[PDB]
Design a protein around this ligand. Structure first.
Ligand SMILES: c1ccc2c(c1)CCNC2
Length: 150
């Protein structure tokens, strides 16, 4: 009964979360997951400001209303060489990573570790925050509120 949450640096409060290192989060689970980080799904404008501060990934994830990849450098294997906030237009499938936005984060790049899931609720799951530098924080809890997701 375990879930790993890989988190990135924050850029203007926006960060990327990958559940168990694979595309596996539904749009409902994504909102719950951000809620557990005292965060919301980013708006498009919040994501564009994050991009301008240095945020990019090579992973599709939910924002409010769309599924996107922020890209600074053109890479052929990431969003087909696009730069900017790339918007996924056509897909058969429903599960991706998520982006989250925390308003209480620093205004620019914050590459300090994340060391809590402040708004998770009581539950049976061992939830582990994994930072890119390997540091980890675990707690027992839950964050999924939709039965379809559990
Ligand atoms: C924290 C821990 C692992 C990973 C990330 C962040 C991002 C890319 N996928 C691996």
């Amino acid at each position: 009964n375990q879930i790993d949450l890989n988190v990135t640096c924050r850029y203007a409060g926006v960060f990327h979360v990958e559940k168990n290192g694979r595309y596996s989060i539904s749009r409902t689970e994504a909102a719950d997951l951000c809620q557990a980080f005292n965060s919301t799904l980013p708006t498009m404008d919040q994501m564009k400001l994050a991009l301008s501060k240095g945020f990019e990934t090579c992973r599709y994830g939910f924002i409010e209303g769309n599924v996107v990849i922020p890209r600074i450098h053109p890479n052929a294997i990431c969003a087909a060489n696009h730069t900017g906030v790339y918007i996924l237009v056509t897909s058969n499938t429903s599960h991706y990573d998520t982006y989250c936005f925390n308003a209480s984060a620093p205004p620019e790049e914050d590459c300090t570790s994340v060391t809590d899931l402040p708004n998770s609720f009581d539950g049976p799951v061992t939830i582990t925050i994994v930072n890119r530098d390997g540091t980890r924080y675990s707690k027992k809890g839950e964050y999924r509120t939709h039965q379809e997701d559990i």
